[PDB]
Amino acid sequence: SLEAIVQNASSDNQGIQLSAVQAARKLLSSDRNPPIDDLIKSGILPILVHCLERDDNPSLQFEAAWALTNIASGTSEQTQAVVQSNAVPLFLRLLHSPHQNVCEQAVWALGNIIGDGPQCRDYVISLGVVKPLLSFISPSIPITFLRNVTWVMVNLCRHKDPPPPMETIQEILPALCVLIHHTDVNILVDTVWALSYLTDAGNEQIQMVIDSGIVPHLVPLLSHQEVKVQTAALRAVGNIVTGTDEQTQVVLNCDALSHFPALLTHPKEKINKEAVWFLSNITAGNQQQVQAVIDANLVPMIIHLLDKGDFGTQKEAAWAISNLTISGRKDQVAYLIQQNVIPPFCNLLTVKDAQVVQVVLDGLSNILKMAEDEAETIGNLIEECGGLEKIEQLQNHENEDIYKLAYEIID
């Protein structure tokens, strides 16, 4: 019965009270459909929140914070009810408890509260949770607790609009740089996903990340044995290289391109796609970065992915080679045309997506404009792969820019 537990949870008999709070925790935890609504409806929230402050009996503190965590793990109305019961300041107090399982359940409850949205996040931030949370980053703390701490940090960084206060982000960044020195896969994955979220906001936070000196620790994770770490690190470093050429070169100076042969040939199509997206952002930069790409001998592999890769990887590879054509040297475009580029490039002129067609058209046009001297040789190659057929068929494309560009480059 759901009334007996709330009736016994207020009993002055400490044994029966702790048993009842434990039974409430069990009802909220073990099952797939916890009866959170009826439990709140019976008035258990104030009882649990006032059990939170009984320093005399830490087991009761633990069980109460546990039940509150599992209540806050549900809908936004239930997390907001936990918050309305003024449990956040009590969790912030429990952070300093000498009993580490109580202090860990407090962190878990705070993480569930922060995960609801920017409002609860900014409430918990304004009450000063960042520094007491980061004080747990030490070898003494067991790795389960540190995993929960890294998860709370991820929840702190996950929402971009409205973003957490830049002061809090500045306080968080060194903690992430400390956590990235870890070996545990879950901690590393969470740290790198938090870095990925932070880099999403724009070039300001990209520069903030770079100033932390964490890129030297993040880049080598592209070759980690665990593929989850690999995809997380690839996302983060791609976000970074979407920034200015100096930021991209900061990433490149850690020798990131060394880690990409194993990515362009990875068995998972997703890692291929993300690697070619990274390299496409690299080719859009200065000609020094294009030459750095060519030096690592990555051009043949991105050509091969353009040829025989999955659809999204093919789109990213078309983007890579087209940015290369736009911001590349005549000799480098010749290097491209030399490595069987145009035959597999022209087979994507038939796809339904209009952006890929626009991109391949502009790429071919700009290589022909870049090499008008010896264009007579290049144009005959298109006939071999049946590319001229698809170009004169594109002349009938619906949107105007594609057809007018086909007409414009028929020369």
Partner: peptide, 11 residues
């Protein structure tokens, strides 16, 4: 990963 987590077992 997940934004909210439910704790089932303690040790």
């Amino acid at each position: 990963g997940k934004r909210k987590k439910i704790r089932t077992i303690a040790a």
